[PDB]
């Protein structure tokens, strides 16, 4: 059934059992069911009123934490000098959530997750060290982060005219302010996001290039620029994006990833050269199956 569990189960008292036809400690793993043997019928227990809560381990609390999803640096100077005719004080990012393994492995514990995304943008700034690198403080620059859905025009320069954003949502935030924050809704075309897609994203049967690419994971692009014109000195802007999911719903739990990730587009694996986390040996080796590695020397 479905039970509400604010705390864990109590233990009840138990007594000597010597019955014919009753075998609580005997199971059958072939049925696909986990053993139902309880501690009170395995051993002679005392009563214990147990008040250990279960709130910290809720799925909403397990996943509802901000983690790094994107980080990228770019130069803030005058790039028009030379053979480059475009200002280029900006960058473009195609939104994905598979770039950093910490959040990725925590998401891939489920096949489908439905959540709203709380996005936090953390800018940092440094002064480039070259020749006349006489420090004069970090300027208080204003930055524009524009969400660009699929099919919308994408800026090609800092001074492009796509930055008016009559329809595209933008945030203007300064270096010295608190981090910018906004919520993206649950914006999938399906009922949930798929962490895994066992299929192809194209009707055409190409030989390779489209396995595991989910058609619905086309969230679009994030373009971030510096609104100010170039200063006489060059600075380096680093933008870190934190994603916190909320209102979370998760289905179909999966085995956690054990091999190190290799790409953001597939589940390819190689492991380490030796245990632990090796393609032949996930757990480290002990001398034999009769060896405690950490044994009390009495």
């Amino acid at each position: 059934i479905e039970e509400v569990m604010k705390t864990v189960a109590n233990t009840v008292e138990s007594e000597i059992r010597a019955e014919l036809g009753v075998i609580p400690s005997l199971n059958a793993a072939e049925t696909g069911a986990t053993s139902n043997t309880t501690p009170e019928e395995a051993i002679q227990t005392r009563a214990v009123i147990n008040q250990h809560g279960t709130s910290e381990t809720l799925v909403e609390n397990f996943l509802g934490r901000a983690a790094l999803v994107m980080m990228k640096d770019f130069e803030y100077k005058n790039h028009v000098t030379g053979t480059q005719k475009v200002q280029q004080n900006f960058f473009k990012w195609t939104i994905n959530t598979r770039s950093y393994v910490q959040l990725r492995r925590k998401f891939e514990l489920f096949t489908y997750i439905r959540f709203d995304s709380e996005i936090t943008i953390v800018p940092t700034i440094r002064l480039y060290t070259s020749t006349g690198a006489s420090y004069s403080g970090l300027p208080n620059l204003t930055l524009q982060a524009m969400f660009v859905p699929v099919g919308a025009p994408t800026p090609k320069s800092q001074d492009s005219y796509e930055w008016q954003s009559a329809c595209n949502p933008s945030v203007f935030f300064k270096i010295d302010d608190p981090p910018a924050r906004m919520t993206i809704p649950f914006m999938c075309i399906n009922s949930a996001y798929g962490m895994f897609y066992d299929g192809f994203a194209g009707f055409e049967k190409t030989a390779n290039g489209l396995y595991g690419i989910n058609p619905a994971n086309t969230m679009g692009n994030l373009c971030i620029r510096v609104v100010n014109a170039y200063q006489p000195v060059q600075y380096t802007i680093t933008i870190r994006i934190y994603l916190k999911p909320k209102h979370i719903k998760a289905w179909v739990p999966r085995p956690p990833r054990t091999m190190p990730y290799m790409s953001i587009a597939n589940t390819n694996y190689t492991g380490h050269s030796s245990a632990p986390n090796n393609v032949n040996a996930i757990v480290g080796n002990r001398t034999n199956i009769t060896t405690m590695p950490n044994d009390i020397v009495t």
Binding site: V4, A28, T31, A33, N36, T183
Partner: protein, 39 residues
């Protein structure tokens, strides 16, 4: 405190204490009893 119009803007909903360990631990057609011999 939520003064935004869209309900998705709200805080997290970390409050759903219902559980069902039985879809995963005992997902069988015939319910297994306690102490009775499985198969």
């Amino acid at each position: 405190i939520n003064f935004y119009k869209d309900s998705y803007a709200a805080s997290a909903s970390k409050q759903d204490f219902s559980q069902d360990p039985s879809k995963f631990t005992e997902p069988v057609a015939d319910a297994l009893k306690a102490g009775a011999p499985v198969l």
